[PDB]
Ligand binder design. Structure first.
Ligand code: SF4
Ligand code: SF4
Ligand code: F3S
Ligand code: MG
Lengths: 267, 534
């Protein structure tokens, strides 16, 4: 699977819902077909790969041991409690496989809110003591590139890899290890309904006339003022995004958003 | 020659989630099986004490493959608990987005997750383009030229000669396998269509974002209705109509024809993967409170007796833990359910999975495309019956042939073609209603201090249901019972084997080092593990 010419990528699935993988499958100009055939070499990815069981393991071992190195993209949080017993693949705890593989990677990218900060399963009471990558492997020097979102905008993944491939270094990161180029602004300052907010023109409810007129959704719970992402500018699927569909932002690209931003419909 | 002993496939790839399959083969046929889901997240524990309004945002993250389904089911659950009757436009927009999800979901399954168990991409290299384009144009109205197919062949060859096969690395077909039948021409046709469906699936997902906010994980639902006032405009309805037409064209011209070709080449697969009982929750309703007002109606069958279709009683579903890593062995109905983790190990105390075992009247039930199609067919549904007869016609097989890995695979395609045309009808009805003057999408409601509700969704994989027990205005107990729990879950306290473990029995295996046959049946169920355990 690994050889010269095409950069190797090893994709790992920890505690997740696969929504992040599905997001990359939505790549547009270049599409997923271009990336897999012409730009990179996806050597391990449980969702699409042809091989399974022992042959799958073999393919991963082959790829991580390659004389050329590899880039690792991580999806999901790592279940720590009770010795990582809450998450096992091929009878190995996710904690082990990640401790064994991540320190060898030339670059590790945590893709999504779960991998980045812990996510949905780390929310109180956190029955599995799940943590993000940097948190569970700090003791091994693993310091990953973050890229938060649930799922993140795919343009943000592609842009980081392409920037890495041509520079052999990272772009510029914020306090949470996220690329300043994609997370250097609150979605609020890039929101079309901003004029409304600035003039106290809020909708009191969704069924109201003011919602129908597109008034600001702050009173209904918009987390946009304390969230960092590029949703309004890049949009999703080249066509829509949360508030344009009339629903407030739930701050999905922030650390402990599940507990920190809830109740979602209150401010 | 015949193999006897154990086989273990961990991880099972080309599925969602983390599954481990253990079988006991004797003389070339699987004699026993166990499906171990090996990841636990505990969404139900996390949900407690929280504002019921937020549930939908938490339960949607139960899965990203079947992205919209959980948020719909949670919203229908609370809607119900609250007693709101949402506007008809809200019902349309919700139904439309769901229809578009069945299409995207099913298209990606056949090509991107199931196909490689039947198709050999390397054989495509020695194919004659001119003769392949010929066979292509005679099974579909979409005409293919030799040049079209030649461009694909060149793309492949360059990729294979680089030594970097990436996703195809240790594929069970490399070097030839006694279980791959397709000749070169056909392998080239399917591969060309595997690559095309990669760019089409993006169109079909964009359809969801037109009204939904995005895909994966939409944001347009709320208690009482929907939030997208834009979905009323002619522009947005045109955009959606355009995308669905294109997506529909692919289903009728590429997907069904390919399916029939692959299925005829593998008609021997009409002998494995059969199950006994089925259940389906029906979908696409006119009345949110009446299950029988759905395009597809509810129903349950026992022992393949499709003449005596029984009604769905919601007080019959109860989940077990005897062979799961949970405290004790007490079966509980969702409204009095408990999620108490207690990990023994593989087979420790005879427990081997993080999935509970939902039983109906104490019986294991298959759910999903096969259940939704056979039930609807027996209930005399016009469209369903029309196309399944046509499909059985082309294949020259009787109805019996449907209880198999073959059938289950056909069924998913059949369901895709009928739902594809039904979206045209709901689109029309929705257009008319708008024209009549109804511009309402969200209804008022009040939060009860104490209440208990449920929401049913028949998703791409089957009967989905969320359950809430509100106490003092907060979430007192929230339980999810999903499609894969039904089919891929473990044995119950009476030791009745689950649907998948049962269908694996008898599966002939040619080469233990490359158990492609097991992957054919397991993938025909379209398993989703993050859904089944939450
Ligand atoms: S960050 Fe979200 S979309 Fe991604 S795997 Fe986690 S729960 Fe899913
Ligand atoms: S509060 Fe939200 S809806 Fe309003 S201007 Fe900010 S991002 Fe826009
Ligand atoms: S909810 Fe998330 S997708 Fe964007 S609009 Fe807010 S950070
Ligand atoms: Mg449950």
């Amino acid at each position: 699977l690994m050889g010269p010419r095409r950069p190797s990528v090893v994709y790992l699935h920890n505690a997740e819902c696969t929504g992040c993988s599905e997001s990359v499958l939505r790549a547009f100009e270049p599409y997923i077909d271009t990336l897999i055939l012409d730009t990179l070499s996806l050597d391990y990815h449980e969702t699409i790969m042809a091989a399974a069981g022992d042959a799958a393991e073999a393919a991963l071992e082959q790829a991580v041991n390659s004389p050329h190195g590899f880039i690792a993209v991580v999806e999901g949080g790592i279940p720590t409690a009770a010795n990582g017993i809450y998450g096992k693949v091929a009878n190995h705890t996710m904690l082990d496989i990640c401790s064994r593989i991540l320190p060898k990677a030339q670059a590790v990218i945590a893709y999504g809110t779960c991998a980045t900060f812990g996510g949905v399963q780390a929310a109180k009471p956190n029955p599995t003591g799940a943590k993000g990558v940097n948190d569970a492997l700090k003791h091994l020097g693993v310091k990953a590139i973050n890229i938060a979102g649930c799922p993140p905008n795919p343009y943000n993944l592609v842009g980081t890899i392409v920037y890495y491939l041509k520079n052999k270094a990272a772009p510029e990161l914020d306090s949470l290890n996220r690329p300043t180029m994609f997370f250097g602004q609150t979605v609020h300052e890039q929101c079309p309904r901003l004029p409304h907010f600035d003039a106290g023109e809020f909708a009191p409810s969704f069924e109201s006339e003011e919602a129908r007129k597109g008034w600001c959704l702050y009173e209904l719970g918009c987390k946009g003022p304390v969230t960092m992402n590029n949703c309004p500018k890049i949009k999703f699927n080249q066509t829509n995004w949360p508030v344009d569909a009339g629903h407030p932002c739930i701050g999905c690209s922030e650390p402990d958003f599940w507990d920190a931003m809830t109740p979602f419909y209150q401010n | 020659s015949s193999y006897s002993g154990p086989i273990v496939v961990d991880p099972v790839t080309r599925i969602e989630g983390h599954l481990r399959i253990e079988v006991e083969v004797e003389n070339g046929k699987v004699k026993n099986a166990y499906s171990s889901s090996t990841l636990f997240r505990g969404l139900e524990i996390i949900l407690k004490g929280r504002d019921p309004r937020d549930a939908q945002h938490f339960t949607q993250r139960t899965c990203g493959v079947c992205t919209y389904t959980h948020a719909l089911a949670s919203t229908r659950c609370v809607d119900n608990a609250v007693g709101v009757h949402i506007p008809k436009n809200a019902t349309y927009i919700r139904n439309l987005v769901l229809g578009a999800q069945y299409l995207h979901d099913h298209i990606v399954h056949f090509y991107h997750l199931h196909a490689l168990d039947f198709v050999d991409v390397t054989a495509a290299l020695k194919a004659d383009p001119a003769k392949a384009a010929k066979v292509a144009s005679s099974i579909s109205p979409r005409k293919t030229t030799a040049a079209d197919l030649k461009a694909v062949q060149d793309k492949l060859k360059t990729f294979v000669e680089t030594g970097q096969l990436g996703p195809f690395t240790n594929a069970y077909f490399l070097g030839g396998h006694p279980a791959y039948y397709l000749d070169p021409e056909t392998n080239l046709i399917a591969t060309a269509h595997y690559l095309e469906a990669l760019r089409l699936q993006v169109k079909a997902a964009r359809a969801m974002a037109v009204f939904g906010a995005k895909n994966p994980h939409t944001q347009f639902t709320v208690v009482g209705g929907v939030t997208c006032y834009d979905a009323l405009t002619p522009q947005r309805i045109a955009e959606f109509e355009a995308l669905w037409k294109e997506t529909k064209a692919f289903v009728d011209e590429v997907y069904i024809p390919d399916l029939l070709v692959v299925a005829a080449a593998y008609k021997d697969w009409t002998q494995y993967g059969g199950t006994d009982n089925f259940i389906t929750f029906g979908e696409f309703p006119k009345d949110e409170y009446d299950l029988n007002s759905r395009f597809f109606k509810p129903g349950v069958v026992f022992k393949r007796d499709f003449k005596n279709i029984k009604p769905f009683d919601k007080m019959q579903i109860e989940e077990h833990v005897r062979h799961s890593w949970y405290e004790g062995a007490e079966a509980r109905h969702p409204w009095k359910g408990q999620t108490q983790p207690k990990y023994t190990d593989l087979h420790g105390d005879d427990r081997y999975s993080w999935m509970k075992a939902p039983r109906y009247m104490g019986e294991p039930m298959e759910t999903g495309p096969l259940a939704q199609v056979l039930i609807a067919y027996s209930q005399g549904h016009p469209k369903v019956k029309a196309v399944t007869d046509a499909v059985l016609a082309k294949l020259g097989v009787g109805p019996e042939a449907l209880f198999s890995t073959l059938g289950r695979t056909a069924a998913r395609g059949i369901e895709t073609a009928v739902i594809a045309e039904y979206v045209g009808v709901m689109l029309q009805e929705y257009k008319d209603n708008i024209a009549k003057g109804d511009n309402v999408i969200c209804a008022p409601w009040e939060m009860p201090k104490q209440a208990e509700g449920v929401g049913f969704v028949n998703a791409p994989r089957g009967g989905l249901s969320h359950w809430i027990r509100i106490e003092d205005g907060k979430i007192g107990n929230f339980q999810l019972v999903v499609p894969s729990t039904w089919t891929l879950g473990p044995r119950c306290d009476k030791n009745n084997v689950s649907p998948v473990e049962a269908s694996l029995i008898g599966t002939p295996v040619a080469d233990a080092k490359r158990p492609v046959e097991i992957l054919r049946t397991v993938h025909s169920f379209d398993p989703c593990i993050a859904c089944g355990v939450h």
